[PDB]
């Protein structure tokens, strides 16, 4: 049983053409890995960096710029 | 008192088309929309070809529901033809007038034939631009027929292999955007609604959408503001595979890691 929603009856749109491509369904279709192209990136969630210690690694204070000096 | 199809697109008015259909079909549904074609030249033939309101219970059964009214020489041969439509388009109704084929034409004819062969290929292009018509026409409509129909548009891309992209643009469905059951947004709307670094079409590949909607693959992203669409189908890993990229922005499944989600988490 149709709905017609509330009238239905006036369309006229038509719309003709062709250009379009068409083969089968008996092909390559199913079975490739999903993950194709690694491409992400989202707003800083902030993780843990610089115990206190200055000098992990080298510097996790960012010690080679001005540090804060407190200025 | 006249062959409907036989007049021009002009001589039908837009009542007689969707009381027409109630013919065809043998039922009393309105059709949402159609599109009257007659062509000219060498080879004569009026395709007239209508989209549903509403599926038929007897169009995912045992028995074949798919195909239109074949005619030749404007006299009755058979019906359900379906050597003219293809299974992603195994929903249309309709009817085709052949002046070329012999009146003594039967359904192994259609099967073989080269010409037929290629009235399937033309109808192919007609009917699909018909239901992004649709889609442009009255998207509430095209709603109610994605709801009814949508499981058979989604064997699309299969089919036709290089025509991928404009199935992916008819292709419906929910997500993270809203909490709907009802296959809403599309991968125009997706496409429209990226902001920064979101680039990678987010999808869950999952057979029921309770399960998929609970999954906490979803949360891990929906809480860092990315969008990922409901699929609950039973094709939707298959019909997925050949989706593996649209417009140059590729798809994840979500139930799947990569670096994405090692530089998004």
């Known amino acids: 049983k149709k709905i017609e929603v509330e009238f239905d009856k006036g369309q006229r749109t038509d719309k003709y053409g062709r250009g379009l491509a068409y083969i089968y369904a008996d092909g390559k279709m199913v079975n490739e890995a999903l993950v194709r192209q690694g491409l992400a990136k989202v707003a800083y969630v902030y993780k843990p960096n610089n115990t206190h210690e200055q000098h992990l690694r080298k510097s996790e204070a960012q010690a080679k710029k001005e540090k804060l000096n407190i200025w | ?145 994605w709801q009814q129909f949508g499981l058979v548009l989604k064997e699309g891309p299969a089919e036709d292999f290089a025509n991928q992209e404009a199935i992916a643009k008819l292709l419906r469905f929910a997500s993270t955007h809203t909490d709907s059951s009802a296959q809403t947004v599309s991968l125009e709307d997706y496409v429209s609604r990226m902001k920064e670094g979101q680039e990678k079409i987010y999808y869950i590949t999952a057979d029921s959408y309770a399960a998929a909607k609970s999954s906490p693959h979803l949360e891990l992203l929906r809480k860092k503001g990315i969008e990922v669409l409901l699929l609950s189908d039973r094709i939707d890993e298959w019909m997925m595979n050949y989706l593996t990229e649209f417009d140059g922005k590729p798809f994840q499944s979500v139930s799947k890691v990569d670096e994405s989600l090692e530089k998004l988490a």
């Open chain 2, 1 to 145: 008192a006249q062959a409907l199809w036989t007049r021009n697109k002009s001589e039908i008015t837009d009542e007689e088309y969707k009381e027409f259909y109630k013919h065809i079909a043998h039922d009393f549904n309105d059709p949402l929309t159609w599109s009257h074609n007659r062509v000219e030249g060498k080879q004569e033939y009026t395709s007239l070809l209508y989209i549903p309101s509403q599926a038929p219970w007897d169009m995912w059964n045992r028995d074949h529901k798919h195909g239109l009214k074949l005619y030749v020489q404007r006299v009755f041969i058979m019906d359900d033809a379906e050597q003219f439509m293809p299974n992603y388009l195994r929903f249309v109704r309709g009817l085709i007038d052949s002046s070329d084929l012999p009146l003594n034409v039967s359904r192994e004819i259609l099967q073989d034939s080269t010409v037929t062969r290629n009235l399937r290929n033309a109808l192919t292009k007609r009917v699909l631009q018909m239901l992004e018509k649709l889609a442009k026409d009255d998207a509430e409509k095209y709603q109610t027929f």
